[PDB]
Amino acid sequence: FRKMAFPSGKVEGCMVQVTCGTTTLNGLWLDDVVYCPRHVICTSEDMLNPNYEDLLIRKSNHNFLVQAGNVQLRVIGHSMQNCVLKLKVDTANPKTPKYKFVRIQPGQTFSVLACYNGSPSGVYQCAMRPNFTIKGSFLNGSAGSVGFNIDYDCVSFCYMHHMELPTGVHAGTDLEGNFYGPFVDRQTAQAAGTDTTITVNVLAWLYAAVINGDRWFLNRFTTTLNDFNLVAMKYNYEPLTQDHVDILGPLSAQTGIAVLDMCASLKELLQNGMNGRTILGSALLEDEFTPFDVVRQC
């Protein structure tokens, strides 16, 4: 049962390089606008307390060097929207796919096309953690790489990468430049809150395990929602809401296992561990598959 990313070709055709001065990162070229993180206008002296309004007013259009492959795009206007820059260019991207911008909630999954100097390095699947970070592989120069889904012929852009936090996890914005979580694009001291396990995704993954023919971890018990949350939170699991219970309704009907019965199974798994066994090829409880992902790939 593999984590699958979406095919990245529709996003590859939108990646460009953006350079301002001696600072370079990736941009996203959709129609005649390039979107990129605003800290491309920072020097090494503007990393702790940059005033972006002041840094930007000192820039003209020709201070922004945008390269698509071997072509240099002409910037004919620029503005800042929250933490992203929007660079108007004089060519619409002929490879622009059908797209939309969406802001996601913690627990949601998406694919990341990690890029450097406007070129793709690889694609991986990840989830927005409950503490609003993501566990990516992102190196120096990766800012401006984007996260996305492609459920039905249309690319939904939901993440643009900005920064790395001291524990190595990553923080960024939606495509309107609003950060996920309480983070800011400054190198002043910041740390992500304690991360929790995405309970609704674990339950979806256990249903996936039942669907692929494994039932060894079920038991004959049920639980109330409140008793389940009292136990689960002792293992740093996110509380399960009635909303989450509704989300799982389809998978419960497919398997014949009530949602609160699967919750009883999860409580026992937390108490027992795996005892040398595995579930869907894993010795840990997996929480980066959503109920939607599981219905999708089953």
Partner: peptide, 9 residues
Amino acid sequence: EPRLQANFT
């Protein structure tokens, strides 16, 4: 410290 992940030179 947190790191902005543009390439700075």
